[PDB]
């Protein structure tokens, strides 16, 4: 088996429908609690802001089908097969097994894309829709949450994901973060309209932000082996240099949050201890007592953990990436221009020795106001 | 299992040596014939240009060890273990199996890096050398043949590859192609000095360029399933649309050169037939007979096959990538801004219907002029 075809772009065939009103269609890979992380969770929150009184609503599942357990967090929605065509106000349709099957697409069906392959499909549905109903192309809403070609080496998927940004028909970009919008602007992408939303502190975490802290000798690592953008292996190699080169490294505890993984030997009997996904209560507790953080994001997006860590009194090691430099956002953030295990280890020694106030990101504490503005354009 | 280390950056330990003169040390992944294409082949050709009368020469194999047959094109070099320290004028040392072992590194050993991990090792050796011998850092010569972070998704390997360009010690960059140089300059990378060499037609192909041409209805495809940058699966998907959409597709032969693969069914009983690696002679004969070419390169680098095809009278489909647009170089080249299977297929239809002489890249048919200037500088 050599790579022949591209699974992300399996045709997404439609048939016509009699359904009359405006209907917003959110294309998401999955709604499984299993996959209820970052992007999908944000898209759903955003989709929830659209006025139900003004738009019917359908969620189309592109990659995975839910459990009965999964559907419990969508009780108000009707679960409906694609062979069916029913005028429900709220519905969910599984469509990850698409071969020789179609989904009903109405004249005024409007599409909201998330993952690049969902936008890839939406842009082909819109053309089919235009030809079929004899109408000008409807606007697509594209919730852009990272430069998704960066999830791939230069390859077919890289250029197909980038192709979604070069689409010339009507398309509203909504960016996760201003920095990401600006990265897109600098590369010269054009959209009919552009919007962004900024990172906002978790509401549970904010309630702990003013608690008295009793700082301990803890280095807190954002550890996600499965998300390569988080540079897990680079952090681990940096920790090994730190442990060997710093003679006081035995005084320190090194802890991982994010993704549960096996504890890793770092030298001198010291381990990176994985806690994984904590409740927000427990995470807040760990942040209050932690003194140094490491959180890398190979992307123009700031990522959330460095922002959380900085507001809880941690000196936080993170990375510059092109237009992104978080060192200007908050006095607790240390940004590395040259990212190798040696510089990370050196910086960690200086920070450990520092253990022995200024914020320019007031937006982060105290959101989708532009949704009404978008409602009127769709 | 999870990765805990980064294999590309395994320590590359040195020990001192008494050897006296200047010595040029080519760091290459391997010299095996199976890998004697692309970058490594070009690095050896450049290395060959340096004066044997002025420099001792050593080749250091960082990834793979030669078979007896592989050393037959290196009869003038002595093959020596890293445990030995001999003052030969010409030698090859294997150093891919590194653990608990050292390579001898003399005071005036100068390093020539190729793959990014070889530059990453060189930059550490140089610092070690500077401290051990009490000398200012020696210049590294860096043969940069592509933007190598682009061989990875955003990841640890991505940033480590990029860190080789951000190194602040003395470093001369030698770029494969002016386009690649411009790409680097546009991203703001700094080096002590910058040189580049331009694409030159293979001399054996050149011998067939003046021959009579009997053009057939053949579409020629550069098929490299293993080289993601060549977007094989994209081409296959565009070919399947072409076959289905173009009612005259049954008139055309579609042939693949580059890497051997199974013949792929495209529809209508038409196959993409794989010829794989051909002698230069057979390739020339095919080029003289083919009328349309497809060769993709997801990289600022031009790649060679588009240029080869365009000089043999083929109408060539290729891609733009940032500062690269090959349609300005030669009238036979069509460059696609929007790269999807549909646009490729549509272009192929236009070129087929075209079946029913202007070059701005003269350098190509008329290379290391800077070697002397570098020699004086090292």
mmCIF file of N, CA, C and O in Angstrom, chain B residues 55 139 172 192-193 195 371-378:
data_model
loop_
_atom_site.group_PDB
_atom_site.id
_atom_site.type_symbol
_atom_site.label_atom_id
_atom_site.label_comp_id
_atom_site.label_asym_id
_atom_site.label_seq_id
_atom_site.Cartn_x
_atom_site.Cartn_y
_atom_site.Cartn_z
ATOM 1 N N UNK B 55 43.663 21.821 0.792
ATOM 2 C CA UNK B 55 42.956 21.207 1.917
ATOM 3 C C UNK B 55 43.020 19.677 1.908
ATOM 4 O O UNK B 55 42.845 19.039 0.870
ATOM 5 N N UNK B 139 34.581 29.278 10.701
ATOM 6 C CA UNK B 139 33.424 29.344 9.811
ATOM 7 C C UNK B 139 32.899 27.957 9.477
ATOM 8 O O UNK B 139 33.675 27.021 9.223
ATOM 9 N N UNK B 172 28.783 30.446 6.405
ATOM 10 C CA UNK B 172 28.542 30.773 5.005
ATOM 11 C C UNK B 172 27.447 29.854 4.484
ATOM 12 O O UNK B 172 27.553 28.641 4.601
ATOM 13 N N UNK B 192 26.915 35.069 7.607
ATOM 14 C CA UNK B 192 28.125 35.837 7.365
ATOM 15 C C UNK B 192 28.253 36.149 5.874
ATOM 16 O O UNK B 192 28.604 37.258 5.494
ATOM 17 N N UNK B 193 27.987 35.152 5.039
ATOM 18 C CA UNK B 193 28.090 35.288 3.592
ATOM 19 C C UNK B 193 27.088 34.385 2.902
ATOM 20 O O UNK B 193 26.720 33.343 3.434
ATOM 21 N N UNK B 195 26.008 32.583 -0.911
ATOM 22 C CA UNK B 195 26.273 32.190 -2.279
ATOM 23 C C UNK B 195 25.174 31.234 -2.736
ATOM 24 O O UNK B 195 24.462 30.629 -1.907
ATOM 25 N N UNK B 371 33.825 29.038 -5.614
ATOM 26 C CA UNK B 371 34.567 28.112 -4.751
ATOM 27 C C UNK B 371 35.868 28.753 -4.263
ATOM 28 O O UNK B 371 36.169 28.717 -3.072
ATOM 29 N N UNK B 372 36.611 29.357 -5.186
ATOM 30 C CA UNK B 372 37.848 30.067 -4.866
ATOM 31 C C UNK B 372 37.660 31.167 -3.830
ATOM 32 O O UNK B 372 38.391 31.218 -2.846
ATOM 33 N N UNK B 373 36.685 32.041 -4.057
ATOM 34 C CA UNK B 373 36.349 33.089 -3.097
ATOM 35 C C UNK B 373 36.012 32.513 -1.710
ATOM 36 O O UNK B 373 36.340 33.108 -0.682
ATOM 37 N N UNK B 374 35.371 31.350 -1.687
ATOM 38 C CA UNK B 374 35.122 30.650 -0.433
ATOM 39 C C UNK B 374 36.410 30.065 0.168
ATOM 40 O O UNK B 374 36.636 30.178 1.378
ATOM 41 N N UNK B 375 37.250 29.460 -0.676
ATOM 42 C CA UNK B 375 38.519 28.881 -0.221
ATOM 43 C C UNK B 375 39.357 29.916 0.526
ATOM 44 O O UNK B 375 39.851 29.644 1.618
ATOM 45 N N UNK B 376 39.494 31.102 -0.064
ATOM 46 C CA UNK B 376 40.252 32.202 0.528
ATOM 47 C C UNK B 376 39.662 32.672 1.854
ATOM 48 O O UNK B 376 40.333 33.317 2.647
ATOM 49 N N UNK B 377 38.407 32.334 2.091
ATOM 50 C CA UNK B 377 37.652 32.875 3.206
ATOM 51 C C UNK B 377 37.568 31.899 4.381
ATOM 52 O O UNK B 377 37.208 32.290 5.490
ATOM 53 N N UNK B 378 37.903 30.633 4.135
ATOM 54 C CA UNK B 378 37.727 29.568 5.130
ATOM 55 C C UNK B 378 38.945 29.376 6.038
ATOM 56 O O UNK B 378 38.773 29.080 7.226
#
